[PDB]
Amino acid sequence: EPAKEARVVGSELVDNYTVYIIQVRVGSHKWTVKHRYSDFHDLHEKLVAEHKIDKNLLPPKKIIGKNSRSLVEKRRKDLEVYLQKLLAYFPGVTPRVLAHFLHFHKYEINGITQALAEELFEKGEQLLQAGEVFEITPLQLYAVTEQLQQGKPTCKTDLGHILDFCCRLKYLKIQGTEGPFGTSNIIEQQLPFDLSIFKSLHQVEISHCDARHIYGLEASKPTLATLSVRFSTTSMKEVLVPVIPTWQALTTLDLSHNCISCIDESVKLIPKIEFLDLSHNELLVVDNLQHLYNLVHLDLSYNKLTSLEGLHTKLGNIKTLNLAGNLLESLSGLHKLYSLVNLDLSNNRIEQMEEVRHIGSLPCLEYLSLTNNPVTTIPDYRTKVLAQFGDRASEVCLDDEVTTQKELDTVEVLKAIQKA
After folding, report:
1. By the 8 A CB rule, do 356 and 334 touch?
2. Which of 186, 188, 304, 317 has the highest CB neighbour number within 10 Å of its CB?
């Protein structure tokens, strides 16, 4: 275990008092904390009362002399010696007062895990029984992972109480913070942690992490039905891959808001997917979705897709398809998606009204969005689109609007003109 070091590096004026600035170092991690003298005095009272500490160890409250800078410098030195004596006297388990004083509960492995076991003691059983989402940080998961790798005992201990909760939890959210955590040098995304301690997860939500550093999600592979990973991966296989067993329960997968640039071989591991969100990524083409026979809702919006040619050979019997925010000018290839019900093409580049011919004969379509495409500026746009749906013109919601009988009457005469 790393040695714990404290330095009183300086001081500054806050309101009408001086705070002493302490840099705390534990191995490679470093953080800063600020305390006025009376916070050290309040610390010292608890340490003498509860841990038998020498009552004269703290420098004096009364301070007198002619040079204020020199007095503050002597107090700075003396408070540094005080903290170093305390840290040498408690090399093992740190008193909770001293842990909170140096912010070990926020940045130090044993303080973090102590604070987590206090949280789970107070609230854990209630939220397990309520079926509520538990929120945790990569730094908490790191600290738990590190104690297990240090071989720290379970028998129960704080680490035992934590494991017994993680074993049972069904609903989990892991949220990383972008950049340095608090007053520390810690980058959460660089911290490795192991989810094997979770053994009954049904739903998981990961945001602002790095999936290179996440291990052990496969311990909940028999139970995991829903997975969201956002702002956290470069590929699907980086999340879905450690014979490899399939994600047998997984019906909802959200990998939106990432840098994913292809659909990869890890599709072989997600055969029962019903809902797939891949929006806000770097996709240029669709492929490898052929064998996801249960896929019903597909979101590919805000990628860099430019063609839909052959899409019926790449997809199963999809019902809802979102392609909004891509680079599409042509709808060629959609005309064989006979199962399709809901289609979103908003915010693309569609400009020829004649492209609607690729969707007008679709037998099940009930919803179409073309908002923010150039085609929407054409005169009589709505009635021109709906007329291409033939005798289904009454059955399609166009652009989130109720179709009027004035539209349908305008369509029936336009259709009689096209018939003649």
Report:
1. no
2. 188
**396 contacts 386 by C-beta, under 8 angstroms:** yes
Supply 364's token pair.
Answer: 């099940």
| Enclosing H/E stretch for 325 | none
Which 8-state DSSP code applies to residue 355? G
Other Cβ atoms less than 10 A from the Cβ of 268: the count is 14
Are 209 and 234 spatial neighbours (Cβ–Cβ below 8 Å)?
no
Beta bridge partners of 207: 175, 230
**Residue closest to 198 by CA, chosen among 220, 176, 215:** 220
Three-state secondary structure of 158-222: HHHHHHHHHCCCCEEEEECCCCECCCECCEHHHCCEEHHHCCCCCEEEEECCCHHHEECHHHHCC
Cα 147 from Cα 159, distance rounded (Å) = 8
Taking Cα atoms as reference points, which of 88, 81, 3, 68 lies closest to residue 40? 81
193 contacts: CB under 8 Å, gap ≥ 6:
138, 141, 142, 144, 145, 213, 214, 215
* 244 in Cβ contact with 218 (< 8 Å): no
SS3 106: helix
Please count the residues of the chain. Answer: 420
Instruction: Give Dmax (Cα) for the chain.
Output: 108
Residues 220 and 249 sit within 8 Å (Cβ to Cβ):
no
Is 354:380 a contact under the CB 8 Å cutoff? no
Query: What residue ranges define each of the domains in the chain, with the CATH number in brackets?
Result: 4-102 (3.30.1520.10), 305-420 (3.80.10.10)
148, 159 in Cβ contact below 8 A? Answer: yes
- Strand spans (E) along 15-74: 17-26, 29-36
Name the residue with tokens 């925010």: 325
Apex CA 57: angle with CA 6 and CA 25, to 5°?
A: 5
Method: X-ray
Q: In what order do the strands lie in the sheet with 29-36?
A: 4-14, 17-26, 29-36
How far CA 3 is from CA of 91, 100, 193, 277, 403, in Å, comes to: 8, 18, 22, 46, 72
Residue 411: both structure tokens together: 């369509």
